[PDB]
Amino acid sequence: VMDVMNRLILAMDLMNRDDALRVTGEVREYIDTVKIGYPLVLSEGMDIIAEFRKRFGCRIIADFKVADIPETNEKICRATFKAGADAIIVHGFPGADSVRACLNVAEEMGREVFLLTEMAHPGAEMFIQGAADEIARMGVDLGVKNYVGPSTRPERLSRLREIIGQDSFLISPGVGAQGGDPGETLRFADAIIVGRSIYLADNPAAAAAGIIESIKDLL
Amino acid sequence: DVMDVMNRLILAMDLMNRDDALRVTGEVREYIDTVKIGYPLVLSEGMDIIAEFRKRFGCRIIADFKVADIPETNEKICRATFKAGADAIIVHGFPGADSVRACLNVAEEMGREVFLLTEMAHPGAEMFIQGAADEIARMGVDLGVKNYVGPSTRPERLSRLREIIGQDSFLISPGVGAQGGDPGETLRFADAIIVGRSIYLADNPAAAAAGIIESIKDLL
Ligand SMILES: O=c1cnn([C@@H]2O[C@H](COP(=O)(O)O)[C@@H](O)[C@H]2O)c(=O)[nH]1
Numbered sequence A: 001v002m003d004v005m006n007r008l009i010l011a012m013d014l015m016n017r018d019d020a021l022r023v024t025g026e027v028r029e030y031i032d033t034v035k036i037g038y039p040l041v042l043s044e045g046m047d048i049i050a051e052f053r054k055r056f057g058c059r060i061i062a063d064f065k066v067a068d069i070p071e072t073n074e075k076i077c078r079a080t081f082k083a084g085a086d087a088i089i090v091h092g093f094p095g096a097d098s099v100r101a102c103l104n105v106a107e108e109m110g111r112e113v114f115l116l117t118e119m120a121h122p123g124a125e126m127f128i129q130g131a132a133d134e135i136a137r138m139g140v141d142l143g144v145k146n147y148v149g150p151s152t153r154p155e156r157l158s159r160l161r162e163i164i165g166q167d168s169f170l171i172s173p174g175v176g177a178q179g180g181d182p183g184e185t186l187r188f189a190d191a192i193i194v195g196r197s198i199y200l201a202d203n204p205a206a207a208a209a210g211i212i213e214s215i216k217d218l219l
Numbered sequence B: 001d002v003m004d005v006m007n008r009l010i011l012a013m014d015l016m017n018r019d020d021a022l023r024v025t026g027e028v029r030e031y032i033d034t035v036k037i038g039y040p041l042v043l044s045e046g047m048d049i050i051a052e053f054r055k056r057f058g059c060r061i062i063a064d065f066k067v068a069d070i071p072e073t074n075e076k077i078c079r080a081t082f083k084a085g086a087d088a089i090i091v092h093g094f095p096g097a098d099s100v101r102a103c104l105n106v107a108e109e110m111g112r113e114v115f116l117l118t119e120m121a122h123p124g125a126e127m128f129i130q131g132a133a134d135e136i137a138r139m140g141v142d143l144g145v146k147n148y149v150g151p152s153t154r155p156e157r158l159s160r161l162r163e164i165i166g167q168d169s170f171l172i173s174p175g176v177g178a179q180g181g182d183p184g185e186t187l188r189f190a191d192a193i194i195v196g197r198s199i200y201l202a203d204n205p206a207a208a209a210a211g212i213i214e215s216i217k218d219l220l
């Protein structure tokens, strides 16, 4: 199982290389796992992943919300792992074949797939939430061991944990800016994902330290 | 007014090597003036590939990024994508109305276009997407979406999507060729067809494109 320092994953969604590297550097003592998404990658290129590894030695989760047909999913995963990502986040909504395509490449390259089952934002209630339990069961059926679920709905996050079992690994975004509470989220998730509450703060290091202080008894 | 797609045929350029992608696109330039570029090529070669396509070919660029995040992140993705020179971006509807609205707002402020993906063409689409597709399309219409993507592989579903969005809306459709969809049948409902492997894996992509076009000549 992935060992995330302080149970805290930084969502590095700044869109400027200099800012992204500076802020990550400021909080490096607190984390060893960084989630990199399209805001940074599409602004600065996939080479940024290798840079992060060179500078920080952190693990990298590519939050690419993979959501294409199987053939295209395979290509996306291949390009992503070639860039040095340790793991990739994949939507479950497009169905089992699309998830399997990602699992196959991950196995080939020594990486992990994280299955996103319910999202944290209000619009998730329209279509995703009603599918989310079934998506989680699909993950179980497919042998998925890593999952993403919403901090903003702790009862939904708890249900996800119930479906996947205590052995599966669960990470959760929506902490801070979107309204989720760090400690409550860690009742169910192995690690919390935090973006803006850290990277937009006046003092990113103090923000990170503060969150960690608030969950000290859970570490 | 909608984009004027030459020969009603959009190339899905999913080769992952700049030299090959450039060669093949150049070879079909006389048949196709609209190119769909997705993550296979962009993650391999960088967003500057959009610039290179513009510089080398006349072509309009549709960024098939299947945008599927929270509103705040969707906004950033659309901004980066338009900054790079994409004419339009493809967005998933299944994450809900706020996520789509975020993309529409950026498109409006930046003078570009959103295409809403409603149902997908692959077998797995039957599990969750198909059951939501009619409502996703209706949501699109309610939000003022004018451009849509729907599946060539399910003519019945594509026909229903066209009904929902109306004749004024612009509809493009992948799954033609490799995935089993038929060019002419698909153009009964879609304004344009998207074709990838049938062209870009052909020994002569120009001949492949020309053949598809000959097969739909009466619809042009
Ligand atoms: O359901 C989800 C899935 N992913 N994210 C991602 O998690 C991060 C959260 O950032 P924030 O802490 O600044 O809200 C962003 O990168 C966002 O795209 C969510 O917020 N909710």
Ligand SMILES: O=c1cnn([C@@H]2O[C@H](COP(=O)(O)O)[C@@H](O)[C@H]2O)c(=O)[nH]1
Residues within 6 Å of the ligand: A068, A069, A072, B012, B014, B038, B064, B117, B119, B120, B121, B122, B150, B151, B174, B175, B176, B177, B178, B179, B194, B195, B196, B197, B198
């Ligand atoms: O529902 C969809 C949405 N998008 N695509 C995209 O359309 C292209 C189809 O390529 P192909 O003609 O070689 O099948 C690929 O880029 C694929 O990701 C689909 O195939 N089906």
